[PDB]
Amino acid sequence: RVQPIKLARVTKVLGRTGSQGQCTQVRVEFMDDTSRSIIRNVKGPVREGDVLTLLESEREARRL
Amino acid sequence: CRFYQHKFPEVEDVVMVNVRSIAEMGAYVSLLEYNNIEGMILLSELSRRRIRSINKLIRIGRNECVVVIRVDKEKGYIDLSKRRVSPEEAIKCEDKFTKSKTVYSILRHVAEVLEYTKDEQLESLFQRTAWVFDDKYKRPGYGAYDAFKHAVSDPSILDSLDLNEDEREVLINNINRRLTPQAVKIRADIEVACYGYEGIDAVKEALRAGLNCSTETMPIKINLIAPPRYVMTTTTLERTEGLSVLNQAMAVIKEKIEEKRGVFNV
Amino acid sequence: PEKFQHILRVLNTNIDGRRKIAFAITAIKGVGRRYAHVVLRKADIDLTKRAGELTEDEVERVITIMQNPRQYKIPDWFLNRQKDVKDGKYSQVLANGLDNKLREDLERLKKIRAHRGLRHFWGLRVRGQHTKTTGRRGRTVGVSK
Amino acid sequence: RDKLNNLVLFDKATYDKLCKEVPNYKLITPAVVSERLKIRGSLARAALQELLSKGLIKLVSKHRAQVIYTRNTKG
RNA sequence: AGCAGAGUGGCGCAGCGGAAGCGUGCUGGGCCCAUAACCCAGAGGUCGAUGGAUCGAAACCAUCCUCUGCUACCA
RNA sequence: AACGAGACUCUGGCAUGCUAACUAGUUACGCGACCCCCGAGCGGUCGGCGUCCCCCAACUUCUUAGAGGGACAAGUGGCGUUCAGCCACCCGAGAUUGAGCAAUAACAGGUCUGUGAUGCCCUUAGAUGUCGGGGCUGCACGCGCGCUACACUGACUGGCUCAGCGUGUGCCUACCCUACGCCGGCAGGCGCGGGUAACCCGUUGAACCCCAUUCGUGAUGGGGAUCGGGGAUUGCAAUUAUUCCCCAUGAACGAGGAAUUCCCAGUAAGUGCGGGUCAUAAGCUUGCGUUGAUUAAGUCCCUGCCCUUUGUACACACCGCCCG
RNA sequence: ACACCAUGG
Ligand SMILES: [Mg+2]
Ligand SMILES: [Mg+2]
Ligand SMILES: [Mg+2]
Ligand SMILES: [Mg+2]
Ligand SMILES: [Mg+2]
Ligand SMILES: [Mg+2]
Ligand SMILES: [Mg+2]
Ligand SMILES: [Mg+2]
Ligand SMILES: [Mg+2]
Ligand SMILES: [Mg+2]
Ligand SMILES: [Mg+2]
Ligand SMILES: [Mg+2]
Ligand SMILES: [Mg+2]
Ligand SMILES: [Mg+2]
Ligand SMILES: [Mg+2]
Ligand SMILES: [Mg+2]
Ligand SMILES: [Mg+2]
Ligand SMILES: [Mg+2]
Ligand SMILES: [Mg+2]
Ligand SMILES: [Mg+2]
Ligand SMILES: [Mg+2]
Ligand SMILES: [Mg+2]
Ligand SMILES: [Mg+2]
Ligand SMILES: [Mg+2]
Ligand SMILES: [Mg+2]
Ligand SMILES: [Mg+2]
Ligand SMILES: [Mg+2]
Ligand SMILES: [Mg+2]
User: Fold this and answer.
1) Residues packed against strand G, CB within 7 Å
2) Which residue, C31, C17, C96, C100, is CA-closest to C63?
3) CA–CA separation, B192 vs B195, rounded Å?
4) Chains C and D touch (3+ CB pairs under 8 A)
5) Cα distance between residue C123 and residue B20, in whole Å
6) Which residue segment(s) compose the domain that A29 sits in?
7) Considering only CA atoms, which of B135, B117, B114 is closest in space to residue B125?
């Protein structure tokens, strides 16, 4: 019930999912072990390479 | 003025709240079982099933009992929920709430003639009265209204503690008028079919045999509802100790009416 | 600073003492704000003291100006009542002279039943306004029978 | 709507509080004095100007819209 | 005549002393190309009448009146 | 092979290169004149301010408007079956300015009240072809396009300093835009010139904005409905108040339920100014500038549209058809 | 990885 923050760097933009095409699929690293990688769904206009912030690195969202 | 022994409600408590504004992702609602720190109920948590219009569930100015789930005891974020209530909780909360409201309005007259420049002296009186009043009776399940009850009947604890002036006046002269008759219901469920012509005197001697070990001055409430019945409202205490006055009383009546001529009831 | 009485009861109406004297006396009917500044200017009064900071003798100097404006050299185009229909005088009706002068004017109109008198009677709009979609006080009507 | 009570000229208690509030503040604007005291605001302006005429305060910026002061330019 | 229950918006009703709302109806509007369903605004109150307690009631107490069910059914 | 798309025509953005200008200018000095020392100096000279007056001085940067020039996905790097093309970047005034014009087939769309375009029907001297008066404005109520507001990111009172598109004496018809002087608080009045217009109104002294003063959270000095009294102009005539000015009266309204409209960069919005109608005269509309954002660079969810495949008992075409 | 969507001078 307590987890630290994690900071990921965007490495690729996949597509614009969501029902109105609002959120964006993105693949991130983890900036402490660059081996890790997940797919996340962001809400603003991501570019490439900028540092997101994850409040629960364990999830991995898979659609809209 | 604070309602209870803790200013911030704890988790898993049911609270009386007056909804005030239907938000975009919740509703901002007042707090009425605790002081008016805001509360936010999530819109995902009004009802367990799909809703046609929110005004059919909640609308500004409707007392309702809701359960808090989480709270930042520091910053002041009272997270509230309505899916998670049984209508019994509503009862056990609303009755104690309507008790606490009269205790609030009663502990208000002292500030009329005593210092009232600050809402904090209300807290001053609150910590000396309500905290100690419920720190005892909360083990079996009773509150400070029960203490004021035990007081205005036999005034014995208000003296046992620090005594005020004119506040025991506004205590009793309000409670024992709102603590007002607990109506009695014991009547004489006896059917007799008389066979004695001298019996009009038997009924009189049995009326004077109504309540035993007692006097000929204390009044009794006779009712002639059925001519073959003899119905009485006995020694009027509270409907809590005149039980034997129904348990044993009718016996002398039925026997003395049965002894004369012919067999009778019991 | 200046902790003596403030409120004053100028003729038949309670002039609050707090507001600036200009905006203080406007609580009199018939006396708007453009007329009040002229009255105060011709009264020589300072225009940076509230109603509470005037003694009992300046206020009479102001009253007598409000009542007799024509003679303190306030021109004949400031007065709200001009060539008065019944007698040719020019003056400012002040407090209940305004009520009675409106009352008398409506009576004067209705008496000869002019087209305006009847409009004041029937309670309608007296100038030339359309009335199909305006005013609109009454209650809704339904088509059901 | 309520009744924000305000005075147009001081009473002795409030006048004392004015001549003693000067150090207590690092931000002296007409609005804050009009709210912490029960001052109309056209009175707070005059009182602040009066104090400034006594060198008790230091004017840091005056504009047509907003005015400010400071504590003493000391300490 | 008696017992029990009830008397609150046009109508059915909720309302364990800090005090007027719910379902439906009426009037109007929204949605649709229209109409029903569905959504929202407004009006409508001697809380049966009379007194009393209470700091205060529609609510508690007392008297009376009016409806409903059931026996009593009574020169 | 033909049409539509595109090409095209107008417009906005760039030329210190060309053509050439008392109906546009600038710089210079020929000037001169005014004024201040404002600085060297003293006051002139050295200078500073000039929509002060000149030049038969020099030129075309600003102004005007003609001919040509320029931009092509042309260069460089990625992705492309190495095609058609897409993405980023360099140089640049600019790497997507805004409009006009528009197909085949249709609709029982609108218009006989634009027409001396028009078939048929009607009325035709007691007229359905002219003058005087009234109406289109009538108010219990339902809706639509709008204007002004609910104030302090404000209202009032002074002070300061900036535009662009335009129109202007009327052919019957009978009227135009206004300078400058004087009179009146104001609307307005009299007098005497310019303009058929880059020539005069006019350097179009526009509002918001900008700077300084009063008010103080109060339906208040916010807001300006409704109503009383008076004074002018237009016209043959102003009452049911044409418009306009002054004193006075001082309502609802404290950011608006269910719903729902418009919008992507000099755009939304705020702000004023010309054209149309116009004897008088915009809360309209058509254009013009002026201060100038937040959010997006997407999708097919909702409402719709285009192309292919598929199903149909529909073809007046799902607002269809049809069973008890 | 399916709430409700009837009718037509
Ligand atoms: Mg072009
Ligand atoms: Mg150009
Ligand atoms: Mg010049
Ligand atoms: Mg060209
Ligand atoms: Mg290439
Ligand atoms: Mg460049
Ligand atoms: Mg184009
Ligand atoms: Mg076409
Ligand atoms: Mg036609
Ligand atoms: Mg024809
Ligand atoms: Mg004719
Ligand atoms: Mg005619
Ligand atoms: Mg019309
Ligand atoms: Mg329209
Ligand atoms: Mg007209
Ligand atoms: Mg216009
Ligand atoms: Mg004109
Ligand atoms: Mg016009
Ligand atoms: Mg029009
Ligand atoms: Mg296509
Ligand atoms: Mg097919
Ligand atoms: Mg087919
Ligand atoms: Mg068929
Ligand atoms: Mg059909
Ligand atoms: Mg159908
Ligand atoms: Mg349908
Ligand atoms: Mg049917
Ligand atoms: Mg049918």
Assistant:
1) A 63; B 50
2) C31
3) 9
4) yes
5) 43
6) 3-64
7) B114
